[PDB]
């Protein structure tokens, strides 16, 4: 999703409420860089300070629970990931072999979804068909599409 | 709505169009 949900908010409340040392429903701007990292993330000092500038615009030095949840809502996204792309190929590998054919990859791109262009299809074939030696080695092709 | 097969195809197509964007820069209006 592009936005947060009640089942995510219910877990983030338990972490935020330990840093609510005043009991008023707020944390400080210095506890922000603690609570986001104690939730298992690791943003930079610069990314943390830029998210503080988005909520400390009133100059009060404090952050309410819904203002902290705006940072988490902005962090949710529908974009691509290796764990999402890998499952699409695993659904099409009906034999469970860890490889598919060039005919299957051409068909599943030209028939299903929106119909992919032949110059995009023939490139998607080329880089997998060379590596898997006449088969499509999808398990490593997942990485070659999104490595950084 | 679309089928499980159709959204699985569109996930592979979107990842490949991102791979094409970083290779060929033809739609690099992002920056």
mmCIF file of C-alpha atoms in Angstrom:
data_model
loop_
_atom_site.group_PDB
_atom_site.id
_atom_site.type_symbol
_atom_site.label_atom_id
_atom_site.label_comp_id
_atom_site.label_asym_id
_atom_site.label_seq_id
_atom_site.Cartn_x
_atom_site.Cartn_y
_atom_site.Cartn_z
ATOM 1 C CA UNK A 1 0.000 0.000 0.000
ATOM 2 C CA UNK A 2 0.915 3.765 -0.274
ATOM 3 C CA UNK A 3 -0.328 4.460 3.321
ATOM 4 C CA UNK A 4 -0.443 2.927 6.872
ATOM 5 C CA UNK A 5 -3.134 0.575 8.366
ATOM 6 C CA UNK A 6 -4.755 0.030 11.806
ATOM 7 C CA UNK A 7 -2.966 -3.366 12.260
ATOM 8 C CA UNK A 8 0.442 -1.608 11.783
ATOM 9 C CA UNK A 9 -0.570 1.374 14.040
ATOM 10 C CA UNK A 10 -1.546 -1.085 16.853
ATOM 11 C CA UNK A 11 2.095 -2.383 16.981
ATOM 12 C CA UNK A 12 3.803 1.059 16.623
ATOM 13 C CA UNK A 13 1.689 2.370 19.582
ATOM 14 C CA UNK A 14 3.365 -0.190 21.925
ATOM 15 C CA UNK A 15 6.870 1.133 21.014
ATOM 16 C CA UNK A 16 5.845 4.864 21.012
ATOM 17 C CA UNK A 17 4.095 4.548 24.436
ATOM 18 C CA UNK A 18 7.423 3.480 26.129
ATOM 19 C CA UNK A 19 9.029 6.820 25.011
ATOM 20 C CA UNK A 20 5.868 8.782 26.136
ATOM 21 C CA UNK A 21 7.692 9.584 29.438
ATOM 22 C CA UNK A 22 5.420 12.657 30.080
ATOM 23 C CA UNK A 23 2.176 10.571 29.658
ATOM 24 C CA UNK A 24 0.721 13.330 27.358
ATOM 25 C CA UNK A 25 0.848 11.255 24.083
ATOM 26 C CA UNK A 26 4.129 12.851 22.786
ATOM 27 C CA UNK A 27 7.848 12.106 22.316
ATOM 28 C CA UNK A 28 10.787 14.562 21.925
ATOM 29 C CA UNK A 29 12.681 15.153 18.659
ATOM 30 C CA UNK A 30 15.706 13.387 20.286
ATOM 31 C CA UNK A 31 13.574 10.254 21.109
ATOM 32 C CA UNK A 32 12.432 10.112 17.404
ATOM 33 C CA UNK A 33 15.889 8.809 16.343
ATOM 34 C CA UNK A 34 15.604 6.175 19.142
ATOM 35 C CA UNK A 35 12.045 4.876 18.439
ATOM 36 C CA UNK A 36 12.486 4.523 14.613
ATOM 37 C CA UNK A 37 15.756 2.546 15.120
ATOM 38 C CA UNK A 38 14.312 0.392 17.994
ATOM 39 C CA UNK A 39 11.584 -0.659 15.447
ATOM 40 C CA UNK A 40 14.446 -2.347 13.441
ATOM 41 C CA UNK A 41 15.141 0.357 10.777
ATOM 42 C CA UNK A 42 18.443 2.311 10.362
ATOM 43 C CA UNK A 43 17.953 5.787 8.701
ATOM 44 C CA UNK A 44 20.846 8.338 8.707
ATOM 45 C CA UNK A 45 21.182 11.387 10.987
ATOM 46 C CA UNK A 46 20.332 13.485 7.859
ATOM 47 C CA UNK A 47 17.161 11.446 6.995
ATOM 48 C CA UNK A 48 16.074 11.557 10.700
ATOM 49 C CA UNK A 49 16.654 15.357 10.896
ATOM 50 C CA UNK A 50 14.696 15.920 7.612
ATOM 51 C CA UNK A 51 11.690 13.964 9.082
ATOM 52 C CA UNK A 52 12.016 16.113 12.261
ATOM 53 C CA UNK A 53 11.890 19.327 10.097
ATOM 54 C CA UNK A 54 8.560 17.986 8.648
ATOM 55 C CA UNK A 55 6.926 17.810 12.198
ATOM 56 C CA UNK A 56 8.886 20.345 14.418
ATOM 57 C CA UNK A 57 7.737 23.204 12.069
ATOM 58 C CA UNK A 58 5.800 24.633 15.111
ATOM 59 C CA UNK A 59 9.147 24.864 17.077
ATOM 60 C CA UNK A 60 7.753 22.980 20.154
ATOM 61 C CA UNK A 61 10.543 20.264 20.258
ATOM 62 C CA UNK A 62 7.905 17.434 20.479
ATOM 63 C CA UNK A 63 6.021 14.984 18.215
ATOM 64 C CA UNK A 64 2.449 13.637 18.729
ATOM 65 C CA UNK A 65 1.652 9.960 17.908
ATOM 66 C CA UNK A 66 -0.219 10.773 14.580
ATOM 67 C CA UNK A 67 2.740 13.032 13.470
ATOM 68 C CA UNK A 68 5.189 10.125 14.063
ATOM 69 C CA UNK A 69 2.742 7.819 12.154
ATOM 70 C CA UNK A 70 2.923 10.214 9.087
ATOM 71 C CA UNK A 71 6.636 9.257 8.768
ATOM 72 C CA UNK A 72 5.637 5.536 8.825
ATOM 73 C CA UNK A 73 2.730 6.121 6.341
ATOM 74 C CA UNK A 74 5.189 7.826 3.890
ATOM 75 C CA UNK A 75 7.600 4.821 4.320
ATOM 76 C CA UNK A 76 4.892 2.343 3.057
ATOM 77 C CA UNK A 77 5.088 1.855 -0.759
ATOM 78 C CA UNK A 78 3.727 -0.413 -3.589
ATOM 79 C CA UNK A 79 7.137 -0.458 -5.469
ATOM 80 C CA UNK A 80 9.193 -3.506 -6.614
ATOM 81 C CA UNK A 81 11.243 -5.885 -4.370
ATOM 82 C CA UNK A 82 13.143 -9.219 -4.860
ATOM 83 C CA UNK A 83 10.659 -11.045 -2.527
ATOM 84 C CA UNK A 84 7.718 -9.813 -4.720
ATOM 85 C CA UNK A 85 9.306 -10.538 -8.173
ATOM 86 C CA UNK A 86 10.591 -14.023 -7.121
ATOM 87 C CA UNK A 87 7.045 -15.233 -6.242
ATOM 88 C CA UNK A 88 5.694 -14.247 -9.718
ATOM 89 C CA UNK A 89 8.203 -16.634 -11.386
ATOM 90 C CA UNK A 90 7.569 -19.301 -8.660
ATOM 91 C CA UNK A 91 3.798 -19.184 -9.542
ATOM 92 C CA UNK A 92 4.723 -19.808 -13.262
ATOM 93 C CA UNK A 93 7.245 -22.635 -12.450
ATOM 94 C CA UNK A 94 4.457 -25.284 -12.193
ATOM 95 C CA UNK A 95 7.082 -28.145 -12.272
ATOM 96 C CA UNK A 96 9.138 -26.698 -9.309
ATOM 97 C CA UNK A 97 12.498 -27.072 -11.186
ATOM 98 C CA UNK A 98 13.894 -23.520 -10.413
ATOM 99 C CA UNK A 99 13.998 -22.723 -14.193
ATOM 100 C CA UNK A 100 11.388 -21.950 -16.935
ATOM 101 C CA UNK A 101 11.582 -22.054 -20.786
ATOM 102 C CA UNK A 102 12.165 -19.104 -23.167
ATOM 103 C CA UNK A 103 8.770 -20.074 -24.715
ATOM 104 C CA UNK A 104 7.051 -19.745 -21.270
ATOM 105 C CA UNK A 105 8.709 -16.328 -20.552
ATOM 106 C CA UNK A 106 7.719 -15.057 -24.056
ATOM 107 C CA UNK A 107 4.122 -16.373 -23.590
ATOM 108 C CA UNK A 108 3.608 -15.093 -19.974
ATOM 109 C CA UNK A 109 4.764 -11.568 -21.099
ATOM 110 C CA UNK A 110 2.932 -11.406 -24.535
ATOM 111 C CA UNK A 111 -0.431 -12.948 -23.429
ATOM 112 C CA UNK A 112 -0.848 -12.084 -19.684
ATOM 113 C CA UNK A 113 -0.817 -8.710 -17.839
ATOM 114 C CA UNK A 114 -0.620 -5.853 -20.301
ATOM 115 C CA UNK A 115 0.853 -7.325 -23.545
ATOM 116 C CA UNK A 116 4.644 -6.561 -23.444
ATOM 117 C CA UNK A 117 6.338 -5.183 -26.642
ATOM 118 C CA UNK A 118 8.397 -7.602 -28.791
ATOM 119 C CA UNK A 119 11.574 -5.445 -28.393
ATOM 120 C CA UNK A 120 11.146 -5.583 -24.558
ATOM 121 C CA UNK A 121 10.316 -9.359 -24.645
ATOM 122 C CA UNK A 122 13.351 -10.229 -26.860
ATOM 123 C CA UNK A 123 15.665 -8.312 -24.431
ATOM 124 C CA UNK A 124 14.102 -10.029 -21.340
ATOM 125 C CA UNK A 125 14.692 -13.396 -23.119
ATOM 126 C CA UNK A 126 18.312 -12.576 -24.215
ATOM 127 C CA UNK A 127 19.852 -11.839 -20.772
ATOM 128 C CA UNK A 128 18.209 -14.924 -19.099
ATOM 129 C CA UNK A 129 18.491 -17.427 -22.053
ATOM 130 C CA UNK A 130 22.291 -16.801 -22.362
ATOM 131 C CA UNK A 131 22.807 -17.352 -18.572
ATOM 132 C CA UNK A 132 20.500 -20.445 -18.200
ATOM 133 C CA UNK A 133 21.786 -22.018 -21.491
ATOM 134 C CA UNK A 134 18.429 -22.314 -23.393
ATOM 135 C CA UNK A 135 16.345 -22.116 -20.156
ATOM 136 C CA UNK A 136 15.410 -18.959 -18.143
ATOM 137 C CA UNK A 137 17.383 -18.801 -14.851
ATOM 138 C CA UNK A 138 14.741 -16.608 -13.136
ATOM 139 C CA UNK A 139 16.206 -16.939 -9.576
ATOM 140 C CA UNK A 140 19.285 -14.784 -10.480
ATOM 141 C CA UNK A 141 17.381 -12.677 -13.116
ATOM 142 C CA UNK A 142 15.330 -11.263 -10.137
ATOM 143 C CA UNK A 143 18.607 -9.716 -8.816
ATOM 144 C CA UNK A 144 19.875 -8.371 -12.208
ATOM 145 C CA UNK A 145 16.625 -6.313 -12.585
ATOM 146 C CA UNK A 146 16.931 -4.467 -9.174
ATOM 147 C CA UNK A 147 20.592 -4.582 -7.917
ATOM 148 C CA UNK A 148 21.927 -1.175 -6.600
ATOM 149 C CA UNK B 1 -10.394 -7.450 -11.322
ATOM 150 C CA UNK B 2 -7.243 -8.951 -12.991
ATOM 151 C CA UNK B 3 -6.072 -12.580 -12.478
ATOM 152 C CA UNK B 4 -3.206 -13.804 -10.231
ATOM 153 C CA UNK B 5 -1.281 -14.708 -13.424
ATOM 154 C CA UNK B 6 -1.958 -11.203 -14.867
ATOM 155 C CA UNK B 7 -0.651 -9.303 -11.762
ATOM 156 C CA UNK B 8 2.355 -11.724 -11.585
ATOM 157 C CA UNK B 9 3.134 -10.856 -15.259
ATOM 158 C CA UNK B 10 2.738 -7.078 -14.491
ATOM 159 C CA UNK B 11 5.188 -7.346 -11.493
ATOM 160 C CA UNK B 12 7.873 -8.888 -13.814
ATOM 161 C CA UNK B 13 7.099 -6.276 -16.547
ATOM 162 C CA UNK B 14 7.401 -3.343 -14.038
ATOM 163 C CA UNK B 15 10.747 -4.652 -12.641
ATOM 164 C CA UNK B 16 12.037 -5.116 -16.234
ATOM 165 C CA UNK B 17 10.924 -1.548 -17.192
ATOM 166 C CA UNK B 18 12.917 -0.291 -14.111
ATOM 167 C CA UNK B 19 15.957 -2.341 -15.348
ATOM 168 C CA UNK B 20 15.450 -0.704 -18.837
ATOM 169 C CA UNK B 21 15.192 2.786 -17.186
ATOM 170 C CA UNK B 22 18.601 2.350 -15.440
ATOM 171 C CA UNK B 23 20.184 0.870 -18.651
ATOM 172 C CA UNK B 24 18.775 3.167 -21.392
ATOM 173 C CA UNK B 25 17.541 6.388 -19.572
ATOM 174 C CA UNK B 26 14.654 6.906 -22.125
ATOM 175 C CA UNK B 27 12.101 7.978 -19.418
ATOM 176 C CA UNK B 28 14.603 9.471 -16.833
ATOM 177 C CA UNK B 29 12.369 12.548 -16.032
ATOM 178 C CA UNK B 30 12.485 11.405 -12.314
ATOM 179 C CA UNK B 31 15.415 13.845 -11.530
#
